[PDB]
Amino acid sequence: MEFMDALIAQLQRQFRDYTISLYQQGFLDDQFTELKKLQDPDFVSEVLSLFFEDCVKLISNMARALDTTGTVDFSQVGASVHQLKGSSSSVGAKRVKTLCVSFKECCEAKNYEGCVRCLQQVDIEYKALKTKLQDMFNLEKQIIQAGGIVPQV
């Protein structure tokens, strides 16, 4: 009913704006976009949680392997970096993906110091992406109930 149009309109603004600021800061890219295109109801959010389960897992693999009970298996730190790369790629998680590309250099180079610093950034970075996308999805929920549609941006 037409009094909520005041509100529906503004969150739709809020949404477009935030959404655009996430690309402008390269937290996201064309593959996120590509995955939105696979909506019909909130399946995008389920995929993303499967991706954050991946961060948690794959990162624990790395910290476990990097914490030295005597000489590092760089080959295997590297395989989690590889899966992390592909996984962040397929959702558009652009800062995590970029960090993954540099982190691969550091395995290959057996630069242990780098490998660790790389891990920290990746951990910081995936955790900040989770927060931002929560907001975004929250914002989607606030629009849906409240009777508006979500803009294709």
Side-chain angles (χ1 to χ4, degrees), residues 51 54-55 58-59 62 77-89 93-108 115 117-119 121-123 125-126:
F51 171 71
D54 271 2
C55 294
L58 291 178
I59 296 153
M62 302 171 219
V77 171
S80 291
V81 173
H82 188 78
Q83 295 275 112
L84 192 43
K85 215 212 72 159
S87 209
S88 53
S89 184
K94 207 180 73 172
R95 293 192 184 181
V96 170
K97 165 137 101 83
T98 295
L99 289 172
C100 280
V101 180
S102 292
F103 200 167
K104 202 74 146 287
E105 214 55 53
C106 297
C107 281
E108 262 170 31
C115 286
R117 187 65 48 100
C118 269
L119 188 77
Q121 301 323 130
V122 154
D123 197 71
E125 292 294 333
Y126 100 84

Side-chain angles (χ1 to χ4, degrees), residues 18 20 29 33 49 51 70 78-79 81 95 103 105 109-110 112-113 115 120-121 126 145 148 150 152:
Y18 193 59
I20 289 147
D29 66 33
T33 312
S49 80
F51 171 71
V81 173
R95 293 192 184 181
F103 200 167
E105 214 55 53
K110 309 185 193 206
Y112 177 95
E113 166 180 0
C115 286
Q120 318 171 312
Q121 301 323 130
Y126 100 84
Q145 82 78 43
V150 307
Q152 296 185 292

Side-chain angles (χ1 to χ4, degrees), residues 15-128:
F15 195 74
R16 269 178 273 94
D17 283 35
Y18 193 59
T19 277
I20 289 147
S21 101
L22 303 169
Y23 283 72
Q24 200 150 333
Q25 287 160 97
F27 282 93
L28 299 180
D29 66 33
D30 191 51
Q31 295 320 113
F32 186 82
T33 312
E34 216 73 32
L35 150 74
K36 285 308 222 144
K37 290 183 173 191
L38 321 155
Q39 218 96 68
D40 45 24
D42 63 2
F43 142 121
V44 159
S45 79
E46 287 130 309
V47 163
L48 261 132
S49 80
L50 292 178
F51 171 71
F52 302 113
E53 294 189 347
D54 271 2
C55 294
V56 158
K57 180 215 195 177
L58 291 178
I59 296 153
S60 82
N61 291 5
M62 302 171 219
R64 166 154 80 264
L66 280 179
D67 197 334
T68 166
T69 133
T71 297
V72 185
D73 196 330
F74 287 90
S75 184
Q76 78 172 195
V77 171
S80 291
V81 173
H82 188 78
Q83 295 275 112
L84 192 43
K85 215 212 72 159
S87 209
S88 53
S89 184
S90 94
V91 299
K94 207 180 73 172
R95 293 192 184 181
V96 170
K97 165 137 101 83
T98 295
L99 289 172
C100 280
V101 180
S102 292
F103 200 167
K104 202 74 146 287
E105 214 55 53
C106 297
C107 281
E108 262 170 31
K110 309 185 193 206
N111 172 0
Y112 177 95
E113 166 180 0
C115 286
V116 169
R117 187 65 48 100
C118 269
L119 188 77
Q120 318 171 312
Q121 301 323 130
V122 154
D123 197 71
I124 278 131
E125 292 294 333
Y126 100 84
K127 285 183 196 207

